[PDB]
Amino acid sequence: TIEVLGSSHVTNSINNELFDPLISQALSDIPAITQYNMHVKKGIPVEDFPKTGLFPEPLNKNFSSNI
Amino acid sequence: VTRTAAHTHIKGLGLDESGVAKRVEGGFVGQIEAREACGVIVDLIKAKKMSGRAILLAGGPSTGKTALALAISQELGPKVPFCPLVGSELYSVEVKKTETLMENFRRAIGLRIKETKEVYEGEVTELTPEDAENPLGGYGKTISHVIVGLKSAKGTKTLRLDPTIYESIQREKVSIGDVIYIEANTGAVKRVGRSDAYATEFDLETEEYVPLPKGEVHKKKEIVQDVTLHDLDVANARPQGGQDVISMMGQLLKPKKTEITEKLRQEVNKVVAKYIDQGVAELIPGVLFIDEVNMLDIEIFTYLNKALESNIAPVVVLASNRGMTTVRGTEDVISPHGVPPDLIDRLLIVRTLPYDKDEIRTIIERRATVERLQVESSALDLLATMGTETSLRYALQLLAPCGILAQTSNRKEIVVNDVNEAKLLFLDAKRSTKILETSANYL
Amino acid sequence: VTRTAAHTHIKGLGLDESGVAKRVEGGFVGQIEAREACGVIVDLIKAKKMSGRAILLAGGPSTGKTALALAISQELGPKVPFCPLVGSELYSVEVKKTETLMENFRRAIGLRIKETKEVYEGEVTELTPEDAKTISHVIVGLKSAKGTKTLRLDPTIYESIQREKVSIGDVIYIEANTGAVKRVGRSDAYATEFDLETEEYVPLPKGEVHKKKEIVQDVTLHDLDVANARPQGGQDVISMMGQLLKPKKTEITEKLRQEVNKVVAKYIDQGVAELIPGVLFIDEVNMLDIEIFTYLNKALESNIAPVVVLASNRGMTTVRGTEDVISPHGVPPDLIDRLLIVRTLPYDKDEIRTIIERRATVERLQVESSALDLLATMGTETSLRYALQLLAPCGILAQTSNRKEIVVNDVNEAKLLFLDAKRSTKILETSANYL
Amino acid sequence: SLSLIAAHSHITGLGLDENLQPRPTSEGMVGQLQARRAAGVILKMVQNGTIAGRAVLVAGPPSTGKTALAMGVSQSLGKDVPFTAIAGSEIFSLELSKTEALTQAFRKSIGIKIKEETELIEGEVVEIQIDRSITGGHKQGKLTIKTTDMETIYELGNKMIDGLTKEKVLAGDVISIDKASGKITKLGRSFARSRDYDAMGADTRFVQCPEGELQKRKTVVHTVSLHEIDVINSRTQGFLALFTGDTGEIRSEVRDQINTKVAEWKEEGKAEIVPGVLFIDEVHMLDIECFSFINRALEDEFAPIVMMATNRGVSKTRGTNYKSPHGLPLDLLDRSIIITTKSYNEQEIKTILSIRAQEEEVELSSDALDLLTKTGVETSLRYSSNLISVAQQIAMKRKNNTVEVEDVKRAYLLFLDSARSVKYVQENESQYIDDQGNVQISIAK
Amino acid sequence: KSLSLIAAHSHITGLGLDENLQPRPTSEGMVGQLQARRAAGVILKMVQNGTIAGRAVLVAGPPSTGKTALAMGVSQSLGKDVPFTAIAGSEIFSLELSKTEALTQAFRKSIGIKIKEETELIEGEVVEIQIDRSITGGHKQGKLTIKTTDMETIYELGNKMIDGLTKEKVLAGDVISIDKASGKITKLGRSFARSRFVQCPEGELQKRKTVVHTVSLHEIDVINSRTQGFLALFTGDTGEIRSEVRDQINTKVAEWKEEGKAEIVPGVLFIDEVHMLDIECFSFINRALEDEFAPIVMMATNRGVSKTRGTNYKSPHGLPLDLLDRSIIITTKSYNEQEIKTILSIRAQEEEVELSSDALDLLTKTGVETSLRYSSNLISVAQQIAMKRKNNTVEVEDVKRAYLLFLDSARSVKYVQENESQYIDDQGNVQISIAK
Amino acid sequence: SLPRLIYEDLILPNYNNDVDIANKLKNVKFNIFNPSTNYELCLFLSKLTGEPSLNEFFRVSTTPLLKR
Numbered sequence A: 001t002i003e004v005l006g007s008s009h010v011t012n013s014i015n016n017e018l019f020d021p022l023i024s025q026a027l028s029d030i031p032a033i034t035q036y037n038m039h040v041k042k043g044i045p046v047e048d049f050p051k052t053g054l055f056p057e058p059l060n061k062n063f064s065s066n067i
Numbered sequence B: 001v002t003r004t005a006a007h008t009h010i011k012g013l014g015l016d017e018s019g020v021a022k023r024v025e026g027g028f029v030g031q032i033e034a035r036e037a038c039g040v041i042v043d044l045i046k047a048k049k050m051s052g053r054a055i056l057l058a059g060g061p062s063t064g065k066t067a068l069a070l071a072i073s074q075e076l077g078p079k080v081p082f083c084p085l086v087g088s089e090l091y092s093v094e095v096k097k098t099e100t101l102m103e104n105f106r107r108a109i110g111l112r113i114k115e116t117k118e119v120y121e122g123e124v125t126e127l128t129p130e131d132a133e134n135p136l137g138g139y140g141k142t143i144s145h146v147i148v149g150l151k152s153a154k155g156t157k158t159l160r161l162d163p164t165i166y167e168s169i170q171r172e173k174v175s176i177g178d179v180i181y182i183e184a185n186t187g188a189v190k191r192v193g194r195s196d197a198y199a200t201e202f203d204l205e206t207e208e209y210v211p212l213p214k215g216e217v218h219k220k221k222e223i224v225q226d227v228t229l230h231d232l233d234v235a236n237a238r239p240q241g242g243q244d245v246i247s248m249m250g251q252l253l254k255p256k257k258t259e260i261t262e263k264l265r266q267e268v269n270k271v272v273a274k275y276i277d278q279g280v281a282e283l284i285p286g287v288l289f290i291d292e293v294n295m296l297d298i299e300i301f302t303y304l305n306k307a308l309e310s311n312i313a314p315v316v317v318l319a320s321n322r323g324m325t326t327v328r329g330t331e332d333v334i335s336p337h338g339v340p341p342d343l344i345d346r347l348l349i350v351r352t353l354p355y356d357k358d359e360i361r362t363i364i365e366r367r368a369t370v371e372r373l374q375v376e377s378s379a380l381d382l383l384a385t386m387g388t389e390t391s392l393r394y395a396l397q398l399l400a401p402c403g404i405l406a407q408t409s410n411r412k413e414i415v416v417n418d419v420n421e422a423k424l425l426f427l428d429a430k431r432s433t434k435i436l437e438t439s440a441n442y443l
Numbered sequence C: 001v002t003r004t005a006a007h008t009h010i011k012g013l014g015l016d017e018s019g020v021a022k023r024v025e026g027g028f029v030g031q032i033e034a035r036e037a038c039g040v041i042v043d044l045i046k047a048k049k050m051s052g053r054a055i056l057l058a059g060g061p062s063t064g065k066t067a068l069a070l071a072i073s074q075e076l077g078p079k080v081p082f083c084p085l086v087g088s089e090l091y092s093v094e095v096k097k098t099e100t101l102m103e104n105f106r107r108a109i110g111l112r113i114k115e116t117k118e119v120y121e122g123e124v125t126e127l128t129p130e131d132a133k134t135i136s137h138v139i140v141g142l143k144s145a146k147g148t149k150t151l152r153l154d155p156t157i158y159e160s161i162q163r164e165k166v167s168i169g170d171v172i173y174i175e176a177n178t179g180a181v182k183r184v185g186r187s188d189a190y191a192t193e194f195d196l197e198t199e200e201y202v203p204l205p206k207g208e209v210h211k212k213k214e215i216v217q218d219v220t221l222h223d224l225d226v227a228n229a230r231p232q233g234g235q236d237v238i239s240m241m242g243q244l245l246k247p248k249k250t251e252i253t254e255k256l257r258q259e260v261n262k263v264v265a266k267y268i269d270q271g272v273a274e275l276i277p278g279v280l281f282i283d284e285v286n287m288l289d290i291e292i293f294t295y296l297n298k299a300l301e302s303n304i305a306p307v308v309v310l311a312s313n314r315g316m317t318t319v320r321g322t323e324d325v326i327s328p329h330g331v332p333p334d335l336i337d338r339l340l341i342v343r344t345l346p347y348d349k350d351e352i353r354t355i356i357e358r359r360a361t362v363e364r365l366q367v368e369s370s371a372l373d374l375l376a377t378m379g380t381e382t383s384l385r386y387a388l389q390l391l392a393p394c395g396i397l398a399q400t401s402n403r404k405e406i407v408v409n410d411v412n413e414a415k416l417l418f419l420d421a422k423r424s425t426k427i428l429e430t431s432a433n434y435l
Numbered sequence D: 001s002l003s004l005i006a007a008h009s010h011i012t013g014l015g016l017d018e019n020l021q022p023r024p025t026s027e028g029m030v031g032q033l034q035a036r037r038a039a040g041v042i043l044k045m046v047q048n049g050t051i052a053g054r055a056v057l058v059a060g061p062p063s064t065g066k067t068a069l070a071m072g073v074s075q076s077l078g079k080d081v082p083f084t085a086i087a088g089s090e091i092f093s094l095e096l097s098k099t100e101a102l103t104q105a106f107r108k109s110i111g112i113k114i115k116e117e118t119e120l121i122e123g124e125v126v127e128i129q130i131d132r133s134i135t136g137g138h139k140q141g142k143l144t145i146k147t148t149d150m151e152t153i154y155e156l157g158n159k160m161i162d163g164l165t166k167e168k169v170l171a172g173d174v175i176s177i178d179k180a181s182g183k184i185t186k187l188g189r190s191f192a193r194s195r196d197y198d199a200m201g202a203d204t205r206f207v208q209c210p211e212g213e214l215q216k217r218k219t220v221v222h223t224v225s226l227h228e229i230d231v232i233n234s235r236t237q238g239f240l241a242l243f244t245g246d247t248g249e250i251r252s253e254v255r256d257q258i259n260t261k262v263a264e265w266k267e268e269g270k271a272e273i274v275p276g277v278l279f280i281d282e283v284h285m286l287d288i289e290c291f292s293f294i295n296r297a298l299e300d301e302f303a304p305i306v307m308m309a310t311n312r313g314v315s316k317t318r319g320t321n322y323k324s325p326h327g328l329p330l331d332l333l334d335r336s337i338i339i340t341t342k343s344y345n346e347q348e349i350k351t352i353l354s355i356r357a358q359e360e361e362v363e364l365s366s367d368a369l370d371l372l373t374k375t376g377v378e379t380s381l382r383y384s385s386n387l388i389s390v391a392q393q394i395a396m397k398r399k400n401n402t403v404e405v406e407d408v409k410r411a412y413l414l415f416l417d418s419a420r421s422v423k424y425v426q427e428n429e430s431q432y433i434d435d436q437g438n439v440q441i442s443i444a445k
Numbered sequence E: 001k002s003l004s005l006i007a008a009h010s011h012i013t014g015l016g017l018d019e020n021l022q023p024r025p026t027s028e029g030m031v032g033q034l035q036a037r038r039a040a041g042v043i044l045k046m047v048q049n050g051t052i053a054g055r056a057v058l059v060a061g062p063p064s065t066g067k068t069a070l071a072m073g074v075s076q077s078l079g080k081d082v083p084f085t086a087i088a089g090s091e092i093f094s095l096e097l098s099k100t101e102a103l104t105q106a107f108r109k110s111i112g113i114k115i116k117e118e119t120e121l122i123e124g125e126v127v128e129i130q131i132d133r134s135i136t137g138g139h140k141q142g143k144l145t146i147k148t149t150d151m152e153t154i155y156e157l158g159n160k161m162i163d164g165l166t167k168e169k170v171l172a173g174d175v176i177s178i179d180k181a182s183g184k185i186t187k188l189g190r191s192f193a194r195s196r197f198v199q200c201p202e203g204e205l206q207k208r209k210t211v212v213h214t215v216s217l218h219e220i221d222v223i224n225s226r227t228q229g230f231l232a233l234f235t236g237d238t239g240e241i242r243s244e245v246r247d248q249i250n251t252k253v254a255e256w257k258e259e260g261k262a263e264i265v266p267g268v269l270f271i272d273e274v275h276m277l278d279i280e281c282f283s284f285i286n287r288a289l290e291d292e293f294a295p296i297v298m299m300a301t302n303r304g305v306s307k308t309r310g311t312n313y314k315s316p317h318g319l320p321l322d323l324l325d326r327s328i329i330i331t332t333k334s335y336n337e338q339e340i341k342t343i344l345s346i347r348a349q350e351e352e353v354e355l356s357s358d359a360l361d362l363l364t365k366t367g368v369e370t371s372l373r374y375s376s377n378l379i380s381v382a383q384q385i386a387m388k389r390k391n392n393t394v395e396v397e398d399v400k401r402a403y404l405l406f407l408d409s410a411r412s413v414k415y416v417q418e419n420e421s422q423y424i425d426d427q428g429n430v431q432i433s434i435a436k
Numbered sequence F: 001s002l003p004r005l006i007y008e009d010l011i012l013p014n015y016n017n018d019v020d021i022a023n024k025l026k027n028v029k030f031n032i033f034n035p036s037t038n039y040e041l042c043l044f045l046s047k048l049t050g051e052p053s054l055n056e057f058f059r060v061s062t063t064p065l066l067k068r
């Protein structure tokens, strides 16, 4: 952690770099019912969805976590 | 039954309660003064007070140098970290040799920590997300919260998560009817398996079936962990295990060694000292064993002079079998055991001595009775004379072909004819050199 | 107060308008011919017409080669680029040495671009966008202590505003030419909306909303070369953490340098920029390999090379990377034939005494006359640098016994405490075990 | 262009007649009649273009005009013909083998020629109306492009709608669309609409509104070397490797396939081969492995004409322990043709010095030119060439226009050549650091 | 703070000097070497004055004669907030950095910039938390009651303070510290309620805290180079920082010093075993010492007239003469027997070892005979031999037993030379067989 | 811990430093893939690679690798 005492701009920049929505969305996936909500109930087409599902697949189920 | 390899008849130094050594005890024969000196060194390590004490084991080949270090490691026990090493291993192609030496220095100081965990666990009963008002706004995720209902034994809790925890949950591929395990220290989620409250025989993906977890959903448990300083240094230099982007992409790229700075080691030392001050942690110094120390060159020796004077260094044990040889990386420096005199001034040399006919004979007896072999007395005397004539290791390594040649004749006892046949079939260094000298085309 | 480090009593070459040298001027004592030759070289650099001129200045140790190079750099001024270098710096583990040599060659050619800075800042009083789902333009109202001012804005600047989480009542910073948006913080007029808040509160600008300023930018050709040759990609303006792949140096092709050259020529043709060639200085040139010595011959024949200055203190010495090439100053005859050689003479007794007096009076120390004579007599028998380095312990020993003038007792004590090279070697020879 | 006065910038081609007969003083070259005739023969062999893989070695004493001859060949070769000039020390890379660096140097010197037809429609956007069908599968666009002189209206396809809705234009940007192919570019914003938005923005620039005809026809001829095709066809985005040099040991299959397709394109008539010259200045410091690769690499039809320059005598070839003429092994010298240069006399030195004085805009007297010629006879030639430029500044400090004898004498006193420096070192060797590091810094003993 | 078992130089707390820079015979764990300690005191005063940059000091002498101890005492007497960098000679031969780059990083790690700044902190004891949630969750209202031993107040929270209090879960009775501007909440512990444990804060709830920062030049060089993050200060792969980003830092530091916003704190760079550097490193040091932003360099070596690395000639102390022209030399001498006895008594006192007087005399005699370090090493071994016999003090017989068990250099050389057939020589010959 | 002076004088733009001006000068006004000044190079690269848009190289060269 890098801290600067008394500056909200540092906190905003650090939170933007650590939790950038484009890369965090790329390494994750949208829920299916949420996808049905924004496609059918809101009219957004498929091609302007944010890109998802780019995380690599593990070898087993056993290799998915350190616990 | 088991597998034996050049050792494992040695269990310890075999000393008394007052430090004196029995002649035949602990798998050792002879070497009384060296065993007593190693016992004094073992007591010094167990005192847990000193830093950077270094000794050197000197003597000829097949005299019992590495056996003493292995006996030291067996006498100390498994709770003390012991790091075996060979001098040729410090020459890496990814990082400089100084960093490899300092990493192996920090790998020999252990730490025992009583840490506590915050755990949410149970069987998933519901999984409903709530969407955001502007999904294509560019800033912020698609969802806002996710409602998760967990049910354990005599308990039921409902949780409201951010998208950050739910991203790891759906990376674990969590469905309805699974038993999960959320660790609040790092956000890590483990999917234990399907619950046994439903049907079992209608699956196709070799899952395991888990009963409901006992106790409440929210828990606090104490775990005793055993780590080293090098583990903390490596985990802080290459961060993994967070839920941010940087620690997530760190698990996917290829790992590589890096030159860890002194500032990171100082900060890790500060945090560890703070943990000790609260009565949580406890320091366990250990032993670093560098075998074949003549393979090092002058730069590693000059850095070792600096590294021994630090206030954290463990006990270093070296071994060498050179009389008066030139130090590697130099031309004119001739020093005993291949070790430069400024490093020799900081050591404590323990001498090892060669054996006799009786010690060779009883060592052959011990190695034969370890390997589940039955040897006659005349064959034993023949092997003892063979060992004194050529080498101890050549007599030790000829036991198993003798046993095979005895077994192939439907026999259990090893006799003189098997030893003569093994003499004929297999040679040693002196007879091979004799064949090499009287030969035509570079045999 | 002031830091003095082995130099900084040198302010210039001490030459008048006719080019001749005064004896004591600009912190220099003696050395008339080398100072006059360096003045001629300074005029040649100021003429701004040649390319690839190479001067080597040679002489014994502690005669003033590096002082002369720094005096040249002080005579030229801060506008002209000057890249000091050591010959050992050309060996790197990332690229070949010819790449590092060409980078240091292109680092010594500069540019001068006239720019302007236009800044709008103040407190937001109105943020009304309109669309046609694409926003057409955004009207933003800004307020300061001297009044208010409304603006029209680009949709891209609106996206930059929306990135920074800017609402009504914050204090922002907008540059007109670039489009950079920085959120200073919430205004202090909204400080009492809650008792506890995460937001920081700042006062109003006492200035006007609109500010204008003219600036001059100085860049080199290597800056544009490394700006156009980023291999991972163009990074953001603000990034506290680095990239996921580490970017290394690369062998930059000649095509990129040609494209940069033609772009810079087009911009020079419109009067926007001005070309200022500079000086590349390589100290301890004897440590270069034979391959770099060969590549210097090719690099000195280009159309864009700067003026190169080399220094060495060797006699008949073998060139590095060879076996049997005895050459003067450790420089092969191929490069020697392309050079001009300036000699550097040693000093007399009185010049050493005057140099010691000048080094005493820059460091704010008062020295008695007999102490000065004894220091000058010591300096003629060991070295000049030994007598120059002994002034600070003499001043400390004078300050210990509550005095402000250095007396010969302090000089004798400092001579006893600190040894020179010859007495240390005499101790080294007549000793048993590693001193 | 961006250039100052270089070492030999007075040379513009070899001064040869139509019969390959060198004039004594023409096009900036003085003397060296046989070497200039030989270089004219080599130039004619390059311009014929039917002979591949020839090695020419230029050997002479230093300061004789070997790289001046190569500069004359490069200038008289003409445009759009590749001429790669490298030094011998450039192939010792850290991220490239010597064989691969030599292959990349060899393939940079032979290129192909490609011509294409452009029908550009460059103008300023007035109004774009986007219309879609009820089904939505068909998209029509009302494009109102406008130049200064006139304005017309086009109908755009759905691919133009997709290509314009990405990097969106805002009715007043300057765009140009190719009619035949369909290249889309956004040049910037017009100067007439530069006052309405009150702030610039991050990624915008102001260009002038184009004039004249809206539709223009122009043919463009491109020259592409083989190394560009090798770099491009080896990766997903290869132009960054073209400009940053991180190609990194390209495989042989792509080179073989590129050779095959270049041959079949020459057969089809789309492209034609333009060979060129590779010049390796100071060739004597190459390894023996580089020499073996050069021996084998000259036997291919896709090989340029290689020109090498050496000023060594009978020296030791690097990577071995013996000595050879010119520092080159005998099997490479068997595969070679040697052009020999000879040292100059007084008249040629005088003419070269007068040419260099006229190049640098320096006015010399007759006596100053005679003194500089005498100095260039006694010392080398480059010493007098540098003495000219410093004597100009010395005379300029004296508030005089023409360089006199006194300025040349002062420049001779202030700056030393190699011989006086060697004498002054050898008579005072105790003050300099020796081979053993012994030196005497103290002035009294 | 600063965990450590027992160092080899742990008994030295600094130079033993009075106010007139005169050495006491025994003070602060340093015995003898009066001229060297006086010279090191003069050097320490030169560092403390701060007006002199780029001076090189060489410490030379026989091995095991107070060379590293002197630098350890100087580093102790320097105090905090002054940078001290200690590197060995063989640490700069890296694989990802050039030698001049590693030397530049080591030079710029020892110059500090002192910045003082002000901030507002709220630190108190939490009394009660009231958080109400609507059914829709559109707005969050709340009230926070916090107190010290002298005051009591109740706050009304906004939305993001409520979100930052829900995260990092704060209950009643906790002692927390809140930063208003950055929104960072640190749990200092739990107050004294038995139902880690920290006393309740006193005084005002809102306080002004002046923090003095000390940033090295290397950290600003790493941060200002945009190709690398601040994580390169910990991972270590900065990777040959470009030259042109350092002049901007130098000009900015000069501007800050002119405007009074910052102060320059020079430090000491210590190079131990300087004879292992190459000739290129010495040529780089010759020009790096003449910079204005250069620290005071202390180098130590024990060789005498040896071969300089990378060359084929011999030079005094293993260093070329142009580097020795730029240095002032401090020479250390061998120790007397009384000083050996005092040093051994200090080392025994450090390890809490009780020695008899006859054991101390035996250790002093065998330290004069062989080595100071051998007699220093024998103490802790003989102590464990004493605990084997179950007595506290260390007698003569324990020292004799430890001397019999553990050899020294000369006895090992004698045993090797008497039986050199059993060892592997320079030609790789050995005789493993006992008979014949 | 980092002081506010470094972050406010070296990284963030303000009225007394030229971070944004020099950033624009290096990355836009002297970029060699700029179609307003280097149209010939863009046309040559478009013939070479077959890109349909001539602004592709300028967008690629000023975009981070992960985002690309």
Ligand SMILES: Nc1ncnc2c1ncn2[C@@H]1O[C@H](COP(=O)(O)OP(=O)(O)O)[C@@H](O)[C@H]1O
Residues within 6 Å of the ligand: B006, B007, B027, B028, B029, B030, B031, B060, B061, B062, B063, B064, B065, B066, B067, B068, B321, B363
């Ligand atoms: N005192 C002993 N008792 C039993 N076995 C021994 C003894 N000394 C040596 N050995 C055996 O002889 C061999 C000696 O090898 P080791 O001690 O590992 O290194 P070195 O060959 O250098 O002495 C080992 O395999 C060990 O098992």
Ligand SMILES: Nc1ncnc2c1ncn2[C@@H]1O[C@H](COP(=O)(O)OP(=O)(O)O)[C@@H](O)[C@H]1O
Residues within 6 Å of the ligand: C006, C007, C027, C028, C029, C030, C031, C060, C061, C062, C063, C064, C065, C066, C067, C068, C355
């Ligand atoms: N003419 C002079 N006047 C004043 N100081 C001088 C003069 N010549 C040399 N010096 C001083 O002598 C020292 C040695 O000069 P320098 O050029 O740095 O070393 P070298 O001559 O060995 O390269 C420098 O510190 C410089 O300040």
Ligand SMILES: Nc1ncnc2c1ncn2[C@@H]1O[C@H](COP(=O)(O)OP(=O)(O)O)[C@@H](O)[C@H]1O
Residues within 6 Å of the ligand: D007, D008, D028, D029, D030, D031, D032, D060, D061, D062, D063, D064, D065, D066, D067, D068, D069, D311, D352, D381, D382
């Ligand atoms: N024939 C010539 N005509 C004009 N100038 C020449 C001629 N030959 C040599 N020079 C000049 O001599 C200088 C050095 O000659 P160069 O071509 O470098 O020979 P080399 O490469 O053998 O040293 C150059 O500046 C060049 O201008």
Ligand SMILES: Nc1ncnc2c1ncn2[C@@H]1O[C@H](COP(=O)(O)OP(=O)(O)O)[C@@H](O)[C@H]1O
Residues within 6 Å of the ligand: E008, E009, E029, E030, E031, E032, E033, E062, E063, E064, E065, E066, E067, E068, E069, E070, E302, E343, E372, E373
């Ligand atoms: N004056 C002294 N006071 C206290 N301890 C000393 C003194 N001189 C030497 N020592 C001790 O002697 C040992 C060797 O000295 P050291 O300076 O570390 O080695 P070297 O002289 O080879 O650098 C160290 O443990 C140090 O504590």
